[PDB]
Design a protein around this ligand. Structure first.
Ligand SMILES: Nc1ncnc2c1ncn2[C@@H]1O[C@H](CSCC[C@H](N)C(=O)O)[C@@H](O)[C@H]1O
Ligand SMILES: Nc1ncnc2c1ncn2[C@@H]1O[C@H](CSCC[C@H](N)C(=O)O)[C@@H](O)[C@H]1O
Ligand SMILES: [Zn+2]
Lengths: 262, 56, 262, 60
């Protein structure tokens, strides 16, 4: 048995890599986690032997720690590998970007003496740069999971483009709810206000999953965030609050000045 | 719907054709008026009538 | 005429998106910037009408500011669009990640009233997560261009994975050289030492471009960077120097604590 | 020959898996020479090719 984890990108059918599609086609079995039923039908036509990982999520308003969902997901994948199947895990976007299931499965597979690798895919971050026409290298880039930013001490660089992932569940500590509340978002606004003014324009971004769909690119003041309509697939972009300023300290060590810059 | 979307997402010729004239292309692939309306209004939930894998 | 900028990823042939490949195949003309001659041959077989942007780089030890190189690249692309050609720009990796040529061409094309868009691709960063088995969401991620980190004021969060791109030309202020000097790297080491010990293990990473090639994953102490062997495609990964600390201020506002964390 | 092989290997997950099982066998079967094979096994990319890739700057 063996394992290969691939990503399908965000867009239907077209955003998967040539080689990754090939892996799905030749697999003995595929474990999937895709955005919608259109992608699910696409996958099944490519390879009929599919197990949908969606089933391991809380069903019927049940209370279930996502930690347990992920564990059950990993175990299902490993059961196929241990059985001797050439196993492919097909996750939307990049299989190892803000996704613990693939990394976990690969680690466990290697430990039990199985071949396991991960193939990179196109993530929501990659879609954002393209859709917004922003280069992460322009003034730098930082990414944080929203709740982690709240729970732990992170210090952002306000000259960079800052991304807060999973903004829709920002502050949801139990890991049992599918969305947070406005009061939690308000606490985030107050936290961010350390670096960013209340009137600072931020962007709620949602990459399209269908080819006939337009991305969501809603600009609004940071203050209005708690009233905004957020979805699980929402990412919050916080543009720079300050322009780049010369680092005279290091310039001096280099024995040069701003005017010497090419 | 499903067959159309899958083709459109994969085929750059059809994609450029679509962008040129969405309604003409959609009608040419047999989409109903209500399906076309859903697209043009951007009502994705209606099209499905006709994701967190980590924590902090 | 129209413009579509696509990426081909890092790996030969297999790492391009299905739709992006289709765009190349149906293009009137293609302007390329690919890693090697294997990739160049691959492209020419997909579409014979190819102009190599590589020609706009300084030739024969000439002194040329890279800003001029990029301007000439953009002008070549736009000339084809202005002529009425259905134009595609094929850059390696992601066309809009630490790459100004695509963004610039799209901006200028729109201003002249032409259709222009960018399709996301698999970047070196995307390859890094997979090859090193690191989830950027684990403790967050930050990216900076090495020289910009030196010339301007940037403050890294030492709890996150930090990436310095274009490490090979770190501190080369003229934009006319293809590499920097060990004295320049030593200055960067002293700068980084504000947050990172000299014995802090860092990683020089190079994603493979060929299917028979293993990636470069060289671990060494930060102190030794100035003596290391760097290539233009080298990226420096600096793992966290500190673990995540609790944000009691926010936790209290949320009315919870570490023990209530799901 | 060499180029054709690499292009196919990069795209075809079946061949890739075959290659991973037995590199030398697959390479020899696709007509690669002993020198080419040696280069692959020693990871000498330079010999296999027997260009600048910077597309941005940090001067603002
Ligand atoms: N269509 C979309 N548009 C924008 N952000 C999205 C998105 N789908 C997922 N995300 C982001 O990803 C988070 C889930 S984590 C999964 C991310 C996925 N592996 C990837 O490569 O993108 C969401 O909370 C959101 O922050
Ligand atoms: N094969 C490779 N492995 C690792 N980093 C690479 C790489 N090729 C390019 N890079 C990084 O990218 C820089 C050039 S900027 C172009 C990056 C490309 N658009 C992408 O999406 O990756 C290099 O200086 C290096 O920091
Ligand atoms: Zn990033």
């Amino acid at each position: 048995g063996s394992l290969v984890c691939v990503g399908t990108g965000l867009q239907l059918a077209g955003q998967i890599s040539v080689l990754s599609r090939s892996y799905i086609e030749h697999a003995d079995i595929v474990f999937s986690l895709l955005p919608d039923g259109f992608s699910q039908r696409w996958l099944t036509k490519l390879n009929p032997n599919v197990i949908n990982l969606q089933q391991f999520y809380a069903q019927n308003g049940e209370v279930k720690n996502r930690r347990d969902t992920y564990e059950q997901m990993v175990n299902a994948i490993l059961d196929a590998v241990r059985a001797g199947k050439k196993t492919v895990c097909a996750l939307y976007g990049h299989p190892g970007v803000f996704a613990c299931v693939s990394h976990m499965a690969i680690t466990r597979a290697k430990a039990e003496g199985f071949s396991a690798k991960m193939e990179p895919g196109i993530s929501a971050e990659a879609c954002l740069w393209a859709d917004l026409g922003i280069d992460p290298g322009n003034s730098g880039h930082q990414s944080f999971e929203a709740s982690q930013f709240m729970f732990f001490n992170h210090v952002p660089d306000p000259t960079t483009h800052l991304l807060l992932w999973q903004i829709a569940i920002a502050g949801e500590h139990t890991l049992t709810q599918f969305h947070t509340s406005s009061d939690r978002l308000q606490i985030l606004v107050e936290q961010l206000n350390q670096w960013y003014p209340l009137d600072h324009e931020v962007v709620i971004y949602e990459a399209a999953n269908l080819p006939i769909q337009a991305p969501r690119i809603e600009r609004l003041p940071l203050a209005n965030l708690p009233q905004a309509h957020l979805m699980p697939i929402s990412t919050l972009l916080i543009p720079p609050a300050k322009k780049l300023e010369y680092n005279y300290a290091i310039l001096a060590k280099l024995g040069i000045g701003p005017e010497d810059l090419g | 719907l499903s067959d159309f979307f899958t083709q459109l997402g994969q085929d750059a010729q059809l994609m450029e054709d679509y962008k040129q004239n969405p309604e003409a292309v959609m009608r040419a692939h047999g989409l109903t008026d209500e399906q076309i309306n859903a697209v043009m209004t951007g009502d994705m939930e209606k099209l499905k009538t006709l994701l967190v894998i980590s924590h902090g």
